[PDB]
Amino acid sequence: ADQLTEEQIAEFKEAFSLFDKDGDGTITTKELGTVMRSLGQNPTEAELQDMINEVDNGTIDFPEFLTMMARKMKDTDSEEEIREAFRVFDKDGNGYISAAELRHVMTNLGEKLTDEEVDEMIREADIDGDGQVNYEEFVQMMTA
Amino acid sequence: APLILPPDHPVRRLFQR
Ligand SMILES: [Ca+2]
Ligand SMILES: [Ca+2]
């Protein structure tokens, strides 16, 4: 649905090559950070190291960089949709999701499950054992 | 009539068992 425009890709290319010391087209972890800070963000040591190893020495070219930027777009869109869904699942707006609320919303979404199956999903996502699923437990449940 | 969710929606990915 949501994809990178030609304008964004061109800007990513200019930010990539602006901090590429050689003409190889492959930047390091340290150079990747400067690129990120030029794009209005501020990742840390581990974050930069996790990003560079997710798209494969510790160096990446632009096609791999664009892949990483696309995944960021995919993740940030999923993050808000999960945030959107939580407000929908939380029918009374108390900040928690009961088994009754889960079963009701699932019905409207063409998902007819037994009362036992609903209890299982709640039991599976309930970490602190309050009986209901809050936002933190909901994110882990949706991310998987 | 149930709601129609986009294929790239996390909720539909929750439908997957
Ligand atoms: Ca609730
Ligand atoms: Ca809980």
How big is chain B, counted in residues?
A: 17
Q: Tell me: do A6 and A69 sit in the same domain.
A: yes
Q: What is the DSSP annotation of chain A? A: -----HHHHHHHHHHHHTT-SSSSSEE-HHHHHHHHHHTT----HHHHHHHHHHT----EEHHHHHHHHHHHHHHHHHHHHHHHHHHHH-SS-SS-B-HHHHHHHHHHTT----HHHHHHHHHHH-SS-SSSB-HHHHHHHHH-
Q: How far apart are CA A28 and CA B2, in angstroms?
A: 49
The alpha carbon of A130 and the centre of ligand 1 are apart by a number of angstroms equal to: 12
Residue A101 labeled ligand binder: yes
Please indicate, yes or no, whether residues A51 and A67 belong to a single structural domain of this protein. Answer: yes
Domain boundary among A21, A51, A75: A75
Amino acid at B6: P
Give resolution in angstroms.
2.8
Judgement on whether residues A49 and A81 belong to the same structural domain of the protein: no
Tell whether A65 and A101 lie within a shared domain. no
CA distance A128 to A106: 23
Do residues A70 and A91 both lie within one domain?
Answer: no
Residue at which a domain ends, from A75, A106, A126: A75
CB–CB of A108 and B6 under 8 A?
no
Same domain, A61 and A86: no
* Smallest-distance ligand from the CA of A100: 1
Last residue of a domain, one of A75, A97, A132: A75
Greatest distance between any 2 Cα atoms in chain B: 22
Angle formed at CA A93 by CA A123 and CA B3, multiple of 5 degrees: 75
| Domain containing residue A1 | 1-75
Q: What is the tally of structural domains in chain A?
A: 2
What's the count of helices (H) and strands (E) in chain B, helices before strands?
1, 0
Residues A56 and A100 in one domain: no
Q: Which is nearest to A91 in space by CA: A133, A136, A137?
A: A133
